Design a protein around this ligand. Structure first.
Ligand code: HEM
Length: 454
């Protein structure tokens, strides 16, 4: 039984001022670097314990001892995502129901049906890069985000955001970013319920209205075309839970549309952006990935089966998720009084946070070269210790969109590597933007077409 490390406190503000930064996750990593595998973090009215070692994370991932917790961030996101899948408690009726109704439409088998629409958007990105003039460059997170948003829109909802027809942000995205920013900001307010912040609240309400106006158009467009489709929205609107026999109610459907539009593009856009960063910074790896893409993608557009053969591209993505998991922390609570790691007594309800990027740098698991980009670590994933690698969370509350994300990302990266040579023309220095999720900012590259037709 041991005292838990805790960083510097600031009187009645506790540890809160340590995260007065636009990069709180990266600040927590530096605290982990100093204090080690576990530390307590307190703010007015809350306490979390951050876990950074596989030794401790493996216990937290035991579902008989810990369940998924809504972190403070997720509680603020629930102000507009309600009891959709990401922001619902495991014990809430609508979690299990929506999980049962939606899980078949996101299986590996379902990806065979989504493939052609994923290819439609991927072809749009390739054609955009082919049409740039010689003096121009690619804004990487910008174009990738255009792709991921369009992909979830079209695959999930049969709705075209038409992101490649826009050089200005889509109104939906503007409002989403502003809502997520307000959530992130609220974390750093000692008393977020203070009247002082009433302006922030009314503007938040304006951002929620904009998002809800898009949900209205998505629903109305579906009603007007008819159900000539079997997508996520079809299952939301008409599916029934086998356990209970009930469908989702109207309010829960609306939260699921919001949930899936956001969750279904933002972390994927981060992954693709990081992957490209790591490839351009590691020429030898890029070379091996490009050779795989050239050998496998022998057709003018990729088939589903070809994407499954892009093994090395898959390993590249997993190594990007190892270094920079784009949903960077998940929360748990103790189901009962217990002791963690033989050392740390917890009460029922006590919160833990898995700091995934730091977990993924545990030298006892990965060896001393933890900071290097080496896809070959994922040559034999069976050998990786249980719960060492957790970019998609844990257990029954693990990412339901994992299959979708990896199919999309593998497909798109493969196509990029087949069609273009890339140049890091500015010698970009990694700058990671946090909007709850992680993504490189300011990353620009130039492409040289290999002039392969589509
Ligand atoms: C690289 C891409 C992605 C990453 C890194 C990622 C990561 C995660 C993580 C860590 C969780 C667990 C959250 C928690 O414990 O609080 C999660 C849950 C979830 N993700 Fe993802 N995700 C990705 C892509 C997607 C996609 C593409 C979709 C939708 C198509 C999606 C939908 C969800 C949903 C609905 C949940 C809630 C699952 C449940 O509680 O039943 N995610 N994701």
């Amino acid at each position: 039984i041991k005292e838990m490390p805790q960083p510097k406190t600031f009187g009645e503000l506790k540890n809160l001022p340590l995260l007065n930064t636009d990069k709180p996750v990266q600040a927590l990593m530096k605290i982990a670097d100093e204090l080690g595998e576990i530390f307590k973090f307190e703010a007015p009215g809350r306490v979390t314990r951050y876990l950074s070692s596989q030794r401790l994370v493996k216990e937290a991932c035991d579902e008989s001892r810990f369940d998924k917790n809504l972190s403070q961030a997720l509680k603020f996101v629930r102000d507009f995502a309600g009891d959709g899948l990401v922001t619902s408690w495991t014990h809430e009726k609508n979690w299990k129901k929506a999980r049962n109704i939606l899980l078949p439409s996101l299986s590996q088998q379902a990806m065979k049906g989504y493939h052609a629409m994923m290819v439609d958007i991927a072809v749009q990105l390739v054609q955009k890069w082919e049409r740039l003039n010689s003096d121009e460059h690619i804004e990487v997170p910008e174009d990738v985000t255009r792709l991921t948003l369009d992909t979830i829109g079209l695959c999930g909802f049969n709705y075209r955001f038409n992101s490649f027809y826009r050089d200005q942000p889509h109104p939906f995205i503007t409002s989403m970013v502003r809502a997520l920013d307000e959530a992130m900001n609220k974390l750093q307010r000692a008393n977020p319920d203070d009247p002082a912040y009433d302006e922030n609240k009314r503007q938040f309400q304006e951002d929620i209205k904009v998002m809800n106006d898009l949900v209205d158009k998505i629903i109305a467009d579906r009603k007007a075309s008819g159900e000539q489709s079997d997508d996520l929205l079809t299952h939301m609107l008409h599916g029934k839970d086998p356990e209970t026999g009930e469908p989702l109610d109207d309010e829960n459907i609306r939260y699921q549309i919001i949930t899936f539009l956001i969750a279904g593009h933002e972390t994927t856009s981060g992954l693709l952006t990081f992957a490209l960063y790591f490839l351009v910074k590691n020429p030898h790896v890029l070379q091996k990935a490009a050779e795989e893409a050239a050998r496998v993608l022998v057709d003018p557009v990729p088939s589903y089966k070809q994407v499954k053969q892009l093994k090395y591209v898959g390993m590249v993505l997993n190594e990007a998720l190892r270094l920079w998991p784009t949903f960077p922390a998940f929360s748990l609570y103790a189901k009962e009084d217990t002791v963690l790691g033989g050392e740390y007594p917890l009460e029922k309800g006590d919160e833990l946070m898995v700091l995934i990027p730091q977990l993924h740098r545990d030298k006892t698991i990965w060896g001393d070269d933890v900071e290097e980009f080496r896809p070959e670590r994922f040559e034999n994933p069976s050998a990786i210790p249980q719960h060492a690698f957790k970019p998609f969370g844990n257990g029954q509350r693990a990412c339901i969109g994992q299959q979708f994300a990896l199919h999309e990302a593998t497909l798109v990266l493969g196509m990029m590597l087949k069609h273009f040579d890339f140049e890091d023309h500015t010698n970009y220095e990694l700058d990671i933007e946090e909007t709850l999720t992680l993504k490189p900012e300011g990353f620009v590259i130039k492409a040289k077409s290999k002039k392969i037709p589509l």
